[PDB]
Amino acid sequence: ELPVIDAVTTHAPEVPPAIDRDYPAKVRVKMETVEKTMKMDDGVEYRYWTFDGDVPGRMIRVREGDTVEVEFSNNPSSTVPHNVDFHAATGQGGGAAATFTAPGRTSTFSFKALQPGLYIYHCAVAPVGMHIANGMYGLILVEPKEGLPKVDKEFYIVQGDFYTKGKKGAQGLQPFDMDKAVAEQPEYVVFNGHVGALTGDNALKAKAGETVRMYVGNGGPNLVSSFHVIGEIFDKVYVEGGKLINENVQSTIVPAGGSAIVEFKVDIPGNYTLVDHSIFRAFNKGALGQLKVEGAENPEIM
Amino acid sequence: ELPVIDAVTTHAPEVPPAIDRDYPAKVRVKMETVEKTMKMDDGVEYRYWTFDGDVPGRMIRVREGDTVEVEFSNNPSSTVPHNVDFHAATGQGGGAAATFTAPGRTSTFSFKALQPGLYIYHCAVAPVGMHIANGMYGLILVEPKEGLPKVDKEFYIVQGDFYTKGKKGAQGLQPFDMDKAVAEQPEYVVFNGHVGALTGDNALKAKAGETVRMYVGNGGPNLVSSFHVIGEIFDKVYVEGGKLINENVQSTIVPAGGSAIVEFKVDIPGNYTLVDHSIFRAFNKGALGQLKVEGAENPEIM
Amino acid sequence: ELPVIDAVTTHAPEVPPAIDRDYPAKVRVKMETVEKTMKMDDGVEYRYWTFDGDVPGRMIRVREGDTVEVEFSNNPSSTVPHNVDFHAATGQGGGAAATFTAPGRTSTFSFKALQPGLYIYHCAVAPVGMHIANGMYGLILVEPKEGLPKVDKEFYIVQGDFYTKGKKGAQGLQPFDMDKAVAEQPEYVVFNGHVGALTGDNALKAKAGETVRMYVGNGGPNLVSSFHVIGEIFDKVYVEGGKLINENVQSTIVPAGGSAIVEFKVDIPGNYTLVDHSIFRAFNKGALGQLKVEGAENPEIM
Numbered sequence: 001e002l003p004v005i006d007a008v009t010t011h012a013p014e015v016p017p018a019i020d021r022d023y024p025a026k027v028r029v030k031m032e033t034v035e036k037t038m039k040m041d042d043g044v045e046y047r048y049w050t051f052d053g054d055v056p057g058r059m060i061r062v063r064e065g066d067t068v069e070v071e072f073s074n075n076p077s078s079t080v081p082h083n084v085d086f087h088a089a090t091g092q093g094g095g096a097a098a099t100f101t102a103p104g105r106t107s108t109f110s111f112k113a114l115q116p117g118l119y120i121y122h123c124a125v126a127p128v129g130m131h132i133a134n135g136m137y138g139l140i141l142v143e144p145k146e147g148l149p150k151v152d153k154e155f156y157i158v159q160g161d162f163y164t165k166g167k168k169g170a171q172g173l174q175p176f177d178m179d180k181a182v183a184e185q186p187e188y189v190v191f192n193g194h195v196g197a198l199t200g201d202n203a204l205k206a207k208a209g210e211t212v213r214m215y216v217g218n219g220g221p222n223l224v225s226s227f228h229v230i231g232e233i234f235d236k237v238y239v240e241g242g243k244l245i246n247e248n249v250q251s252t253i254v255p256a257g258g259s260a261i262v263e264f265k266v267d268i269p270g271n272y273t274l275v276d277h278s279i280f281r282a283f284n285k286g287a288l289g290q291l292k293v294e295g296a297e298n299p300e301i302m
Numbered sequence: 303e304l305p306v307i308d309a310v311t312t313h314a315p316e317v318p319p320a321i322d323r324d325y326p327a328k329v330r331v332k333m334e335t336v337e338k339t340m341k342m343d344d345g346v347e348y349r350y351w352t353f354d355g356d357v358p359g360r361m362i363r364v365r366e367g368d369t370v371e372v373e374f375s376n377n378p379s380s381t382v383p384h385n386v387d388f389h390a391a392t393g394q395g396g397g398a399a400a401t402f403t404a405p406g407r408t409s410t411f412s413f414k415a416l417q418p419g420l421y422i423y424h425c426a427v428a429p430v431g432m433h434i435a436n437g438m439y440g441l442i443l444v445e446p447k448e449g450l451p452k453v454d455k456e457f458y459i460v461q462g463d464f465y466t467k468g469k470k471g472a473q474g475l476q477p478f479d480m481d482k483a484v485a486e487q488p489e490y491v492v493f494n495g496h497v498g499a500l501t502g503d504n505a506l507k508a509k510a511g512e513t514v515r516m517y518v519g520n521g522g523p524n525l526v527s528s529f530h531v532i533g534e535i536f537d538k539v540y541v542e543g544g545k546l547i548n549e550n551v552q553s554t555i556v557p558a559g560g561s562a563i564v565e566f567k568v569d570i571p572g573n574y575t576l577v578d579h580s581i582f583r584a585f586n587k588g589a590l591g592q593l594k595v596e597g598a599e600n601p602e603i604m
Numbered sequence: 605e606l607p608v609i610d611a612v613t614t615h616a617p618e619v620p621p622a623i624d625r626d627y628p629a630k631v632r633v634k635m636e637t638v639e640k641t642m643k644m645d646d647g648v649e650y651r652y653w654t655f656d657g658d659v660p661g662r663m664i665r666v667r668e669g670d671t672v673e674v675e676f677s678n679n680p681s682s683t684v685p686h687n688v689d690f691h692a693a694t695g696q697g698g699g700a701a702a703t704f705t706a707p708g709r710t711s712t713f714s715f716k717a718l719q720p721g722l723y724i725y726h727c728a729v730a731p732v733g734m735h736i737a738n739g740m741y742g743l744i745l746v747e748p749k750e751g752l753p754k755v756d757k758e759f760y761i762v763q764g765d766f767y768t769k770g771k772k773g774a775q776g777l778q779p780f781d782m783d784k785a786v787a788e789q790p791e792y793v794v795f796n797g798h799v800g801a802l803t804g805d806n807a808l809k810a811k812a813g814e815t816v817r818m819y820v821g822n823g824g825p826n827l828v829s830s831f832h833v834i835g836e837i838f839d840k841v842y843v844e845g846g847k848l849i850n851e852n853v854q855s856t857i858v859p860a861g862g863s864a865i866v867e868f869k870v871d872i873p874g875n876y877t878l879v880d881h882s883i884f885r886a887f888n889k890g891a892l893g894q895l896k897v898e899g900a901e902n903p904e905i906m
């Protein structure tokens with residue numbers, strides 16, 4: 001019989017603590033879907049559909065071999081059903097059927113995390129593209145039995161493309177636009193659901209000399225990210241989120257409904273900006289994040 | 303001179319028998335190009351230009367070092383010249399010049415399969431994009447001298463984007479639309495030339511516990527696939543169809559005019575759906591396939 | 605202190621000589637930004653913004669551990685300031701802040717090439733996407749300490765998407781078009797700044813039997829290249845320009861703001877054309893280059 005443990009999940013930029021256990025366990029996770037109106041950009045509002053109050057949903061972290069027990073609830077105020085498809089899960093719809101939950105209801109189901117990796121999870125209620133485009137996606141990290149190398153700083157980042165009826169900048173509550181979605185012409189492309197969610201006062205933080213690891217997901221719906229950090233180079237890249245590691249990469253592809261893990265040492269102070277290098281998305285649509293590094297200057301590097 | 307062997311090619315979902323020989327051979331392949339009107343979707347017809355009657359063309363399977371002798375016939379009823387560019391072939395146009403065949407003629411030529419891999423082959427008659435967009439592509443698997451591991455189930459899948467003058471859903475015979483193709487705005491994105499070609503009654507089949515390997519090609523012309531199988535995880539991925547193997551990947555990029563090889567064990571019964579995870583293509587344009595798995599339920603997994 | 609060496613930088617198709625030194629050095633590089641009108645296609649002119657007179661800029665080649673000193677000059681006739689972000693550099697904007705140069709001014713700065721790889725460098729003056737779209741980008745190769753394997757032929761290739769107000773073919777001077785850029789709908793997609801820059805009389809050259817290496821960049825701004833050479837197969841691919849080597853690949857993804865290194869032996873005469881296999885870009889938008897190989901025929905290969 002398997003041990004029962006409550007999972008530690010985090011709201012985004014934050015990542016749960018590393019797992020210090022060398023045996024399988026039943027990990028209980030609680031998730032709620034809530035529809036709410038939030039700021040997309042200055043003077044722009046959007047009706048997001050979320051996993052636990054924001055975009056992306058809370059990061060889940062378990063160990064290879066663990067059984068993940070999910071208590072899935074859909075808030076009474078929701079207008080449509082919601083569920084969840086874990087790319088980390090093996091079986092019918094990644095758990096979608098088992099978690100189909102009408103508003104004001106609760107569903108429970110479990111699945112075994114048979115393989116390590118960094119997996120996207122997202123709502124799969126029809127129409128699928130709309131539920132995803134409204135913000136229903138997050139990440140679940142399944143650590144290898146032996147764990148991952150220790151690192152000084154960890155960040156949870158998820159890129160998504162959004163389709164607004166009005167063009168980028170149009171004030172007020174902007175409705176989801178089906179036509180632009182099908183045509184794959186988003187108005188906003190962002191990290192963690194909103195323009196500036198990880199920039200300015202919300203910038204990520206690290207200290208010079210610290211090793212950094214970013215768990216980068218791409219919830220889509222449609223765009224593929226040419227992920228890059230201005231002023232830095234990826235020492236390591238877990239290609240497409242898998243076991244294969246590449247090194248000295250400037251820009252990595254993060255598939256739609258996919259992920260990547262990148263690591264780099266920030267040996268010099270300054271502001272590093274995360275971007276989808278399909279450039280106009282970054283400087284015109286909002287795909288821009290910042291990692292502010294405090295510390296002391298080294299002219300030998302620059 | 304080498305031992306002669308008549309190639310066994312398969313119409314799509316099916317893959318030819320694995321190669322169990324450790325010596326080079328002259329493999330005789332016969333291909334015919336035929337233009338025909340077929341159903342793209344319910345009430346929607348399209349004039350396809352095909353390699354052997356459907357999209358994709360018949361899968362070819364040879365061994366690294368083999369000499370592939372192609373007898374290329376262009377059906378008498380064709381209205382334009384056709385040829386073939388084998389990405390597996392080294393030399394002028396991948397064989398296109400040597401296989402330029404007018405309607406009612408048969409061209410013969412040969413090429414040595416110098417390197418193992420999973421290669422796209424397609425027509426290259428001007429205008430190249432049009433011949434490809436009308437459905438002229440397939441895959442040729444060149445096995446390594448040592449062969450490939452035995453697997454229980456092998457499937458032949460090729461994604462393609464189609465450009466219809468009318469919008470998706472418009473009834474009747476829909477002509478090829480050059481303007482949409484250049485702008486890279488397809489109306490249909492499908493697996494194996496037709497909406498549902500691999501779904502419903504045409505779903506792929508396997509039994510719980512079987513090892514599965516999918517040879518995934520992307521004939522384009524333009525889209526790049528974020529290939530994924532809902533409810534499953536790729537144990538192995540031959541990155542971009544080459545020698546490099548990744549593991550535990552949820553979604554892999556299949557380059558336009560490229561491929562990928564993914565493997566996974568289907569340990570639990572259910573319906574698994576193949577999709578391009580640039581999501582709207584899958585649930586709005588037709589990039590959706592199904593693998594039905596019969597067998598007995600394991601709750602420990604889900 | 606470090607020996608000072610004037611760098612050899614090459615205008616594109618050409619690559620600087622391999623680095624034959626096993627000790628670090630201070631490599632002096634001179635770069636000038638100049639805005640000039642040039643031919644994009646027959647009867648079509650475009651106002652390019654360039655690093656040293658053309659697109660891409662001159663290729664820089666240094667050794668891991670080298671200190672790169674840059675003397676950056678913005679020509680008096682320029683209408684806006686320019687600078688440079690080296691993806692090879694670690695620190696604030698890859699050197700963008702330190703190289704912000706007004707017209708008629710000169711700036712100097714230096715950085716240590718801490719990691720080997722093939723890096724894109726580009727202007728980063730707001731609006732960033734426009735400075736890149738007008739042609740401001742190039743490559744800097746940072747060799748590994750031990751160097752790279754000897755190869756018979758080396759080529760400098762950089763893809764880029766351009767956005768013109770008029771559609772492809774419209775005669776006269778065509779201004780940059782922001783709306784098409786944001787929507788990611790280029791009119792021209794080319795290798796080395798102009799349609800035909802590497803084709804016809806400008807084709808690359810090699811002899812049968814020679815080993816070839818192409819340093820492939822993708823300055824974007826927005827597209828991702830499914831890079832392929834018709835009639836050839838990539839023996840080796842430095843995945844996304846990093847350390848990881850794939851083999852037997854027909855087509856590789858070159859990320860926006862990213863690169864790749866491909867190698868192949870041209871064992872038979874003929875014309876091999878480089879293309880972005882998102883096919884219409886190649887045959888309709890200009891993403892087409894040629895490598896003409898002289899020598900004698902080998903029927904055994906084809």
Ligand SMILES: O=N[O-]
Pocket residue numbers: 228229230231275689691698
């Ligand atoms: O170097 N990033 O635009």
Ligand SMILES: O=N[O-]
Pocket residue numbers: 085087094124530531532533577
């Ligand atoms: O998990 N596929 O939508």
Ligand SMILES: O=N[O-]
Pocket residue numbers: 387389396832833834835879
């Ligand atoms: O194989 N070139 O389209």
Ligand SMILES: [Cu+2]
Pocket residue numbers: 049081082083123124125131136
């Ligand atoms: Cu939902």
Ligand SMILES: [Cu+2]
Pocket residue numbers: 085087122257530532579
């Ligand atoms: Cu999914």
Ligand SMILES: [Cu+2]
Pocket residue numbers: 351383384385425426427433438
């Ligand atoms: Cu044809």
Ligand SMILES: [Cu+2]
Pocket residue numbers: 387389424559832834881
């Ligand atoms: Cu091709």
Ligand SMILES: [Cu+2]
Pocket residue numbers: 637653685686687727728729735740
């Ligand atoms: Cu500039």
Ligand SMILES: [Cu+2]
Pocket residue numbers: 230689691726861
């Ligand atoms: Cu950049």
